[PDB]
Enzyme design. Structure first.
Site, PDB file in Angstrom:
ATOM      1  CB  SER A 114      -0.525   0.147   0.949  1.00  0.00           C
ATOM      2  OG  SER A 114      -0.636  -0.235   2.598  1.00  0.00           O
ATOM      3  CG  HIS A 147      -4.625  -1.856  -0.514  1.00  0.00           C
ATOM      4  ND1 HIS A 147      -5.445  -1.104  -0.913  1.00  0.00           N
ATOM      5  CD2 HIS A 147      -3.787  -2.239   0.680  1.00  0.00           C
ATOM      6  CE1 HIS A 147      -5.210  -0.555   0.816  1.00  0.00           C
ATOM      7  NE2 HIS A 147      -4.293  -1.487   1.397  1.00  0.00           N
ATOM      8  CE  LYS A 157      -7.563   0.040   2.762  1.00  0.00           C
ATOM      9  NZ  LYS A 157      -8.837   0.633   3.825  1.00  0.00           N
TER      10      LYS A 157
HETATM   11  C1  LIG Z   1      -3.122  -3.887   3.615  1.00  0.00           C
HETATM   12  C2  LIG Z   1      -3.585  -4.306   4.615  1.00  0.00           C
HETATM   13  N1  LIG Z   1      -3.887  -4.892   5.824  1.00  0.00           N
HETATM   14  C3  LIG Z   1      -5.490  -5.349   6.383  1.00  0.00           C
HETATM   15  C4  LIG Z   1      -5.821  -3.485   6.916  1.00  0.00           C
HETATM   16  C5  LIG Z   1      -6.355  -3.980   8.213  1.00  0.00           C
HETATM   17  O1  LIG Z   1      -7.832  -3.314   7.515  1.00  0.00           O
HETATM   18  P1  LIG Z   1      -8.873  -2.207   8.284  1.00  0.00           P
HETATM   19  O2  LIG Z   1      -8.513  -0.988   7.675  1.00  0.00           O
HETATM   20  O3  LIG Z   1      -9.760  -3.721   7.923  1.00  0.00           O
HETATM   21  O4  LIG Z   1      -9.054  -2.789  10.031  1.00  0.00           O
HETATM   22  C6  LIG Z   1      -4.720  -3.172   5.972  1.00  0.00           C
HETATM   23  C7  LIG Z   1      -5.687  -1.196   6.614  1.00  0.00           C
HETATM   24  N2  LIG Z   1      -5.020  -0.078   6.356  1.00  0.00           N
HETATM   25  C8  LIG Z   1      -5.538   1.173   6.382  1.00  0.00           C
HETATM   26  C9  LIG Z   1      -6.568   1.484   7.232  1.00  0.00           C
HETATM   27  O5  LIG Z   1      -7.761   0.508   6.627  1.00  0.00           O
HETATM   28  C10 LIG Z   1      -4.720   1.780   7.148  1.00  0.00           C
HETATM   29  O6  LIG Z   1      -4.594   3.128   7.227  1.00  0.00           O
HETATM   30  O7  LIG Z   1      -3.363   0.860   6.758  1.00  0.00           O
HETATM   31  C11 LIG Z   1      -4.363  -3.014   5.097  1.00  0.00           C
HETATM   32  O8  LIG Z   1      -3.997  -2.020   4.402  1.00  0.00           O
END
Ligand SMILES: Cc1ncc(COP(=O)(O)O)c(CN[C@@H](CO)C(=O)O)c1O
Ligand SMILES: Cc1ncc(COP(=O)(O)O)c(CN[C@@H](CO)C(=O)O)c1O
Lengths: 398, 398
Positions: free
Chosen positions: A185, A213, A244
């Site tokens: 990400s 993602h 997402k």
């Molecule tokens: C690869 C990956 N796996 C898991 C999660 C956790 O998912 P959740 O935000 O639905 O708890 C995220 C969250 N990512 C976002 C919040 O939604 C953040 O700001 O980090 C992620 O990017």
């Protein structure tokens, strides 16, 4: 001094950022949200390009109708654990929707994505076992490692070679979990899963892939990067989120392992929290099922991503990826001042993108992150490109 | 063998329970939910007495209307962190509702109660500092200790004396967090907070109190056991959940500490998860504000609790508490077979209560747990007592 004295540095750092005269990029409030692509922020109509709402499902009429009906029929919450009073009709529905979406016999839903990673990693790998993960893995994956009692082995970011070397030095007998992400990400680049999974299997490791993602828009069935790279039937566990493409809160893990259901018997973050509200699992069910056949949306998303990525690169911006490999486009800047000025000019001109969060970003790296939406119109994308041209030229980035 | 071989014992244990011929008490599905007190389970109309919906808010018309409006106006989810794109109008609303409810300047909402405990404990107390907790603390409190890097000091269940001795043996200089619960959820008994807090302060410790099982119905303002016991202004941090009196999902911590907001800058379970859906924080806001003046509900809840507790004791059941001290009534049984037979007879006769979960229950302890609701009618309570009389006499418990 007391327990909060440890935050004195972080407090001073935030104030230093604010001394520059920028809007606090980490205290933005969406006062109104008109659609997946438009909001009112600071009293101004603003195009949204930093919301990770990849398939625009949050305003889908079927999704909204399912949520309203669930509130009416089942109330505002369950007030209990899935192991006790928290499993309603719609919880059974959402787990079956995931089984159908991924073609798996197993599906376990958690109350957040964060808790799915926290729980699955800390529950699967015990004392005397190994978790092997990419150095730049999501915070929740690292937190799952901390929560468990396994030996943790990090491998150098994005190295098939280092994964292979690190795995090869471990004892053969103990069970091992290799944890990978499809799309990372920070920069929106893709993992070489085909090659990494072959390495994991050579060393007898089980594989967990986080497809947060990529859901709904990678692979013939939208299952993720692993499906796109031909690994159907080879991944032991796939972890994902509802926050997402799906458009609500919640986490999940899917698997064909015959003992997978037994995770419900042991997993503390599954057991010791209230299940999701009826409306949340109803919206998720409807969204997941629509995502199985959302071909027009998928095509629009990728068209928009290619247009944005191609356009920003054409203008002279330095991007996190050479080709358009996901729905995340990262614009790399030279210093915190340049990133701040760019972000503010974009916001003042009517565009919201993300400023990199200091807790998530390594020192010396400065970027803005754009996330494309299936419901962006070609017109909005060209407007956005014009706004980047104007802000980039004004700040001296291009 | 692989990573799931470790679950072979738990699998065999569940099958042993099922060999007795009982409905799986940990796989119950609420097919329809008619009201806070009535559901359809296994095709049968059933009175609910195991849902922890203390104030019946899940079907409140204002609560439901606020949730539907939020879905319509803001969509099904935020898709982002509170630090980025996840703070909408209604997130600001819910935090102000908590400030008003508790009379505090600080309020931080988390996406689950579990994550509030996980995050606040692991973030406040660092390396070289101490977390001092009751031996029988909730799983989420223990998990927060595991997630952090502090020294963990358990004190013998429900001992003011042991808290005092354990604290007194620690070095004076390092900061310390004493973690207590107002009502403990296993037996529904109350903590001696007045005395424990005086001990904490004697030793210079900060105090965190979890008021998950007391909100809206203990203390003049419904703030919790700490308020009822005269400790207003003496508790550094109060942690709670939306999944009991409030009627949805989410967690929170409130405080008057001037640096409290800085927790948002550091707390990983706050930063690295999507914020709650608009509908969830709208229902919570409306519920919290109604709970400030819900006097009729509060009186009904306590009347019902006293009637149930008094009636079961009168019949000869052994209860977890000598007097009616909370909205949880625990019925203590002699063995797992007796608990199973009682639970099944109650279910078959049209009543749902909780069977103690093996992951939560110490070996050699067997109970059923009842939770009272403000929306139970006096008639339903007498019906429930008659059902307990019939089942208890038939199984040989009384
Ligand atoms: C690869 C990956 N796996 C898991 C999660 C956790 O998912 P959740 O935000 O639905 O708890 C995220 C969250 N990512 C976002 C919040 O939604 C953040 O700001 O980090 C992620 O990017
Ligand atoms: C004292 C206390 N503190 C915190 C929590 C966590 O709150 P959450 O369930 O809203 O995450 C619970 C949860 N208690 C329920 C789940 O809601 C359980 O089955 O354990 C609790 O009892």
């Amino acid at each position: 001094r007391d327990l909060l004295s440890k935050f004195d540095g972080l407090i001073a750092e935030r104030q230093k950022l604010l001394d520059s005269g920028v809007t606090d990029p980490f205290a933005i409030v969406m006062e109104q949200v008109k659609s997946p692509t438009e909001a009112v922020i600071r009293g101004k109509d603003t195009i949204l390009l930093g919301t990770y709402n990849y398939m625009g499902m949050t305003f889908d009429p079927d999704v909204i109708a399912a949520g309203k009906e669930a509130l009416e029929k089942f109330g505002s919450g369950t007030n209990g654990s899935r192991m006790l009073n928290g499993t309603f009709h719609d919880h059974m529905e959402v787990e079956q929707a995931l089984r159908d979406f991924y073609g798996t016999t197993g599906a376990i839903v958690f109350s957040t994505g964060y808790m799915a990673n926290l729980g699955i990693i800390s529950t699967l790998a015990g004392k005397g076992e190994y978790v092997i993960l990419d150095a730049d893995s999501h915070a929740s994956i690292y937190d799952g490692c901390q929560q468990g009692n396994a030996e943790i082995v990090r491998f150098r970011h994005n190295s098939v070679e280092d994964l292979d070397k690190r795995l090869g030095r471990l004892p053969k007998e103990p069970a091992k979990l290799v944890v990978l992400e499809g799309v990372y990400s920070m920069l929106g680049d893709i993992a070489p899963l085909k090659e990494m999974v072959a390495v994991a299997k050579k060393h007898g490791a089980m594989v967990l892939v986080d497809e947060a993602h990529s859901m709904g828009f990678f692979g013939p069935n939208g299952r993720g990067v692993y499906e796109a790279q031909g690994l159907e039937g080879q991944i032991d566990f796939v972890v994902g989120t509802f926050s997402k493409s799906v458009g609500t809160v919640g986490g999940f893990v899917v698997s064909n392992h015959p003992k997978f259901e037994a995770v419900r018997l042991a997993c503390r973050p599954y057991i010791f929290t209230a299940s999701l509200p009826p409306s949340v699992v109803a919206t998720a069910t409807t969204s997941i099922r629509k995502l199985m056949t959302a071909h027009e949306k998928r095509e629009r998303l990728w068209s928009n991503a290619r247009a944005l990525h191609g356009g920003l690169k054409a203008m002279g911006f330095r991007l996190g990826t050479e080709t358009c490999d996901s729905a995340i486009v990262a614009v790399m800047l030279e210093d915190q001042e340049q990133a701040a000025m760019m972000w503010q000019a974009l916001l003042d001109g009517g565009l919201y993108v993300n400023m990199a969060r200091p807790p998530a970003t390594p020192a010396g790296t400065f970027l803005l992150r754009c996330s494309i939406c299936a419901e962006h119109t070609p017109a909005q994308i060209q407007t956005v490109l014009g706004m980047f041209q104007a802000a980039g030229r004004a700040v001296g980035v291009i």
